[PDB]
């Protein structure tokens, strides 16, 4: 029944080629309620590798990534490069909480080879250049959320929230 996956929202491209399940069950954890994108996950100590963007494990206490969680399985061909793991959902570090949680979940995440060979230095990144937020809405936020642009008048609030909150650190090499 309950088997979802966490997707992040970076500034760059190469997102929507990761999942063919974009509905899963009956809902998704992250719930836009015409006032703001709430219940977004926040992985601490992890970051992205820019080339073919995937989430990498690091050890800086400050590195983090804020992505949303949908019911799916990556490409139905992954689980060779992704990190599946189970939590009681009280160990999930969300943001802007609106309610309780289902308390039992099955998650996948973009797992990445650390590749020691790279002298690991990072650089923070911010979402701007609204061509970026527009394309990330038009690429994932309609396929995961068909509701937006149908009856959603506060799409502009979605844009503002992705502008204001979503942030992360990147190796930038």
């Amino acid at each position: 029944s309950t088997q979802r996956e966490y997707v992040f929202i970076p500034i760059t491209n190469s997102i929507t080629i990761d999942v063919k399940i974009t509905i899963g069950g009956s809902d998704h954890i992250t719930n836009i309620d015409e006032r703001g994108i709430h219940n977004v996950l926040v992985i601490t100590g992890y970051a992205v590798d820019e080339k073919n963007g995937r989430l990498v494990p690091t050890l800086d206490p400050c590195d983090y990534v804020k992505g949303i969680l949908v019911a799916g399985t990556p490409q139905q061909a992954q689980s060779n490069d992704f990190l599946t793991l189970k939590l009681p959902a009280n160990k999930l570090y969300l943001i802007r909480k609106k309610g309780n949680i289902s308390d039992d979940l099955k998650i996948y995440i973009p797992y990445s080879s650390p590749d020691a060979r790279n002298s690991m230095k990072t650089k923070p990144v911010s979402i701007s250049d609204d061509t970026i937020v527009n394309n990330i809405i038009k690429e994932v936020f309609d396929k995961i959320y068909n509701i937006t642009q149908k009856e959603k008048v506060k799409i502009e609030k979605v844009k503002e929230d992705i502008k204001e909150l979503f942030s992360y650190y990147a190796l930038e090499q």
């Binding site: 703001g36 206490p61 009280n90 160990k91 943001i95 802007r96 909480k97 609106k98 309610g99 309780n100």
Partner: protein, 1024 residues
């Protein structure tokens, strides 16, 4: 003019304070260019510039004890007694430290970032409400510091007892006194304790009456202190510390929502509030009120000798201002509440019930003038003759705040000897004699028909008995049609007699939103609150005793939703939830949207008589265990909390230095002089611990005044000359004041209290509150009241041992799971890398009553309170103190079940914790009883085990051989086991534990191993 510049009193010393001293890389000290407050000055950007000559030469030396522990020369010079590391020691336990690490503002840039986060939340406020920005800052200054992950710092690595925040808030609290004495003259201490709250809570048929009784107890005091928190700012309350206060944060963001503030910055702090001040549920937005009454009916205040109405602060005119003010404000809160009740009632003259509320409020206004609950207010004052010498502080100016506080509480003791119930303020002679009593219902054939909730007042509304009510309510003043009966009988069980106060309770419990009338407080007009309340109609459903007795059945019916409601769907059980109701009962919200109509009344379905043949058969076929009629009423409280706040040692050794061992401390000289030195030496790792224990070696054995300090001044004068920038030489006297202070402590027999002590305590108290809140909800309980030390919750008899174990271990600050965002760890409370201390050295007692769901809540609550307050002070168990068996008093768990009692110790060591090895000894018997309960469920051991121990105790008590008693208990378990080979292995530290009593009607077996079986008999009677 404008004054009260305590915004810098909260910032004079930054939260970056301990790394800039003994820096590792030393960057911020060179990128900001009298050493470390440069950073705070840079942090001073949102408001007035820093005043440096008003809060370091006073109100910083007077706030905390460091000024007297280290010494006023090493305190400021901050370099002559150093250490590399950075630890943090629990205030009560100087034994356990912490590894602070380094996640703090290091770069000159991230500090700007934290300033920007403060700004964006504090830039949307104008200057007309000068006090409102300080108000919001007082709350969020730590919430932003810990929200962004930053571990908090002690006041100084030379004495890591107080967290950097408690010191700051303490300086701010003392600033109320210091401003009031740099001005003309005054300094005040105001204490308020509600008279007889236990009697008041024990007044109500339904649990929805206990809930609102406790909620009123909290809300009236909140209404009276609304005036102070708006007048002198929030940091005027010294108890309870409102740094983690749900009521305060609610009031705060509701006042911020008032007057108009963009609904985009309100969320940035509402998330902070919902995550930390609450635990992660915003149901107080869906209920519109804080769901738990958490204000202790006993508060304190540091009041300044100033007053408004000169449009600014002028000297107080008299010395009876605040007493009269709080009295009138309290009565005003009650009258405003009942006025709003009448308004909301008139707004709904339909619905039957509210029509009755109308037509009885108009009849009994002259009886509702008197509040159902009165208070008792004391005050103590001080003048600059006491804390000043016309140029600076005095020596002994530190022992002032103690002597005043110790003063104030004593006054309360005096007034306590006489108890005057609130019902005595009424005038009922002409009513109850000349038949002037208003009587909605049947005029009693016998005088005037006492109430059924309070049982003491004459009842106004007399609902008939259930013979034929519909034809009995219409021909009387209660009803008007056949429709109102279905809503009058909905909140007044047929037969209930109600007094004016009890009916006002029932009316407030009909919808718990009029309470906002008091929660906001002169903030909105009463009509404006009511017009919201009459706008939305969402139902707040409080459980009953039956709804909590039937928890496991509702559970079993949500795991068989369709199957168990196939044969149903004609009984309004599998009926689809059609409303937008919600409850402050977390377990209710967890379900309801799980397939079963949780609004049903088990008294109406299976706890009923005309029915329950049907329901028994149903539960039989679908493998459902027909419910039990018993719930469990759990009540808790800390022991010697007053003695704790007064700095005594009784909270440390509860059973030895009892209470009369402070009428003369010389008889307990050994224990106090061991424990106080053990603590003082152990607080402060640094380079001063050896210095301090040499000072004590001096004090030890009454080595005369400075006739010995020549042994110790060396240990300072050799060190004072490690630094050159030390301006003047002042080591000839500070070494004398140091041992004078240490002798003061060791000769008074108690740690001298300071405001830092009090805020550090009563903040950990609210943190433990937030912890036990999520603990109760884990065990499907229902929190009637839980404020800090106390607790009053209704749980099923099944998860009461588990709950007691978990809650006790958590009160000490030791657990296994995370409880929301309060991730507790071996004596501290880790909120996302922020270590706040807890109360491990404090003892907490419990009082479980396994009561039938139909027992009168009056007597249940009275017996629970009485068992706790009495048994906790009359029974003694064998405790080991310094490897020597003594007798102890507190930390017991007193179970009662209609005549069966049992006591379970929870300490077994009189200093309950002195290391980290102790945190598993906590309530280590309740898990023994749990292990034994999970053997009788599995059918491995027979219940005869509980009816067999006697013929083994007569031999197990006369024995002095351990390895013989072990065989004996194994044979007592062997003879009553049902499977191949059970393994229980009692921990053999419980043998010889001897419980006793000072000849009370409580009967108790004199050995813990028999109290275990009596506790099991009680628990299992709870499943009858």
């Amino acid at each position: 003019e404008f004054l009260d510049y305590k915004i810098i009193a909260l910032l004079h010393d930054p939260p970056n304070k301990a790394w800039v001293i003994t820096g590792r890389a030393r960057n911020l000290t060179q990128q900001l260019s009298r050493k470390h407050e440069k950073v705070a000055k840079y942090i001073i950007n949102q408001l007035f510039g820093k005043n440096y000559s008003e809060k370091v030469d006073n109100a910083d030396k007077l706030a905390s004890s460091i000024d007297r522990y280290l010494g006023s020369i090493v305190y400021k010079e901050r370099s002559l007694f150093e250490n590399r590391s950075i630890f943090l020691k629990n205030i009560l336990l100087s034994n356990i430290q912490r590894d602070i690490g380094n996640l703090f503002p290091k770069d000159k840039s991230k500090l700007d970032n934290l300033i920007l986060e403060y700004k964006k939340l504090l830039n949307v406020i104008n200057k007309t409400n000068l006090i409102l920005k300080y108000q919001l800052f007082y709350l969020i200054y730590e919430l932003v510091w810990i929200d962004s992950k930053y571990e908090n710092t002690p006041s100084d690595t030379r004495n890591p007892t107080h967290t950097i925040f408690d010191h700051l808030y303490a300086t701010a609290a003392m600033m109320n006194w210091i401003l009031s004495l740099e001005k003309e003259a005054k300094g005040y201490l105001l204490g308020i304790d509600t008279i007889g709250v236990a009697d008041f809570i024990s007044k109500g048929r339904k649990t929805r009456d206990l809930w609102i009784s406790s909620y009123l107890v909290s809300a009236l005091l909140w209404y009276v202190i609304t005036w102070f928190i708006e007048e002198y700012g929030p940091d005027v309350i010294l108890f309870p510390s409102l740094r983690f206060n749900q009521f305060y944060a609610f009031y705060l963001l509701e006042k911020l929502r008032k007057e108009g503030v963009s609904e985009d910055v309100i969320d940035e702090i509402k998330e902070l509030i919902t995550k930390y001040i609450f635990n992660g549920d915003d149901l107080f937005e869906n209920l519109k009120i804080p769901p738990y009454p958490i204000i202790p009916g006993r508060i304190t205040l540091i009041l300044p000798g100033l007053i408004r109405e000169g449009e600014e602060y002028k000297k107080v005119q008299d010395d009876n201002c605040f007493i009269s003010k709080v009295k009138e404000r309290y009565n005003e809160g009650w009258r405003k509440l009942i006025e709003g009740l009448r308004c909301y009632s008139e707004r709904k003259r339909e619905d039957g019930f509210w029509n009755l509320v109308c037509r009885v409020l108009k009849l009994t206004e002259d009886l509702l003038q008197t509040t159902p609950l009165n208070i008792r207010v004391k005050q103590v004052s001080v003048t600059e003759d006491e804390i000043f010498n016309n140029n600076k502080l005095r020596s002994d100016s530190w022992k002032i705040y103690d002597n005043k506080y110790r003063q104030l509480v004593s006054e309360f003791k005096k007034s306590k000897l006489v108890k005057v119930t609130p019902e005595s303020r009424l005038k009922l002679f002409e009513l109850t004699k000349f038949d002037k009593l208003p009587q909605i219902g049947e005029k009693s054939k016998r005088g005037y028909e006492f109430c059924t909730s309070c049982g003491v007042l004459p009842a106004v509304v007399i609902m008939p008995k259930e013979d034929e009510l519909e034809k009995k309510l219409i021909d009387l003043g209660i009803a008007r049609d056949e429709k109102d009966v279905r809503s009058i009988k909905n909140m007044i069980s047929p037969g209930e007699r109600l007094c004016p106060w009890c009916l006002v309770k029932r009316a407030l419990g009909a919808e718990p939103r009029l309470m906002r009338i008091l929660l906001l407080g002169d903030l909105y007009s009463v009509e404006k609150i009511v017009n919201e309340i009459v706008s939305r109609d969402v139902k707040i459903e409080i459980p009953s005793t039956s709804d909590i007795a039937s928890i496991k059945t509702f559970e079993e019916m949500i795991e068989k939703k369709n199957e168990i409601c196939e044969d149903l769907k004609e009984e309004e059980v599998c009926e689809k939830p059609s409303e937008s109701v919600l409850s402050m009962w977390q377990w209710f919200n967890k379900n309801y949207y799980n397939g079963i109509n949780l609004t049903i009344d088990p008294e109406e379905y299976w706890f009923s008589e005309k029915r329950r043949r049907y329901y028994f058969s149903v539960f039989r076929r679908h493998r459902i265990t027909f419910p039990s009629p018993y719930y469990a009423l759990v009540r808790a409280d800390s022991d010697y909390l007053g003695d704790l706040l007064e700095g005594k040692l009784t909270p440390y050794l509860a059973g030895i230095i009892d209470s009369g061992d402070y009428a003369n401390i010389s008889e307990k000289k050994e224990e106090v002089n061991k424990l106080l030195e053990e603590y003082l030496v152990n607080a402060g790792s640094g380079s001063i611990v050896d210095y301090v224990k040499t000072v004590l070696k001096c004090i030890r054995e009454n080595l005369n005044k400075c006739s010995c300090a020549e042994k110790i001044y060396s240990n300072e004068v050799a060190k004072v000359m490690f630094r050159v920038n030390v301006e003047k030489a002042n080591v000839e006297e500070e070494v004398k004041n140091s041992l004078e202070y240490f002798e003061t402590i060791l000769n008074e027999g108690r740690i001298i209290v300071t405001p830092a002590w009090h805020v550090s305590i009563s903040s950990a108290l609210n943190r433990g509150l937030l912890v036990e809140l999520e603990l109760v909800n884990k065990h499907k309980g229902f929190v009637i009241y839980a404020g800090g030390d106390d607790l009053l919750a209704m749980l099923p008899v099944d998860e009461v041992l588990d709950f007691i174990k978990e809650s006790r271990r958590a009160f000490a600050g030791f657990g296994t799971e995370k409880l929301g965002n309060m991730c507790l760890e071996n004596g501290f409370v880790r909120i996302n890398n922020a270590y706040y201390p807890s109360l491990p050295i404090v003892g907490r007692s419990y009082s479980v009553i396994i009561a039938h769901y139909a027992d009168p809540l009056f007597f249940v609550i009275n017996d629970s309170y009485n068992l706790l307050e009495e048994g906790k002070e009359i029974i003694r168990y064998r405790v080991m103190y310094n490897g020597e068996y003594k007798d102890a008093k507190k930390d017991v768990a007193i179970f009662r079940y209609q005549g069966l009692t049992s006591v379970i110790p929870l300490s077994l060591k009189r200093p309950i914790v002195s290391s980290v090895s102790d945190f598993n000894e906590i309530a280590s018997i309740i898990d023994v009883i749990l292990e034994l309960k999970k053997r009788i469920d599995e059918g491995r051991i027979s219940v005869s085990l509980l009816y067999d121990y006697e013929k083994y105790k007569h031999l197990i008590v006369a024995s002095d051989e351990k390895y013989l008693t072990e065989f004996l208990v194994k044979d007592w378990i062997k003879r009553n086991s049902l499977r191949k080979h059970v393994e229980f292995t009692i921990d053999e530290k419980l043998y010889g534990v001897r419980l006793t009593i000072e000849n009370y009607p409580i009967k108790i077996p004199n050995d813990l191993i028999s109290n275990i079986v009596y506790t099991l008999r009680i628990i299992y009677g709870g499943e009858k």
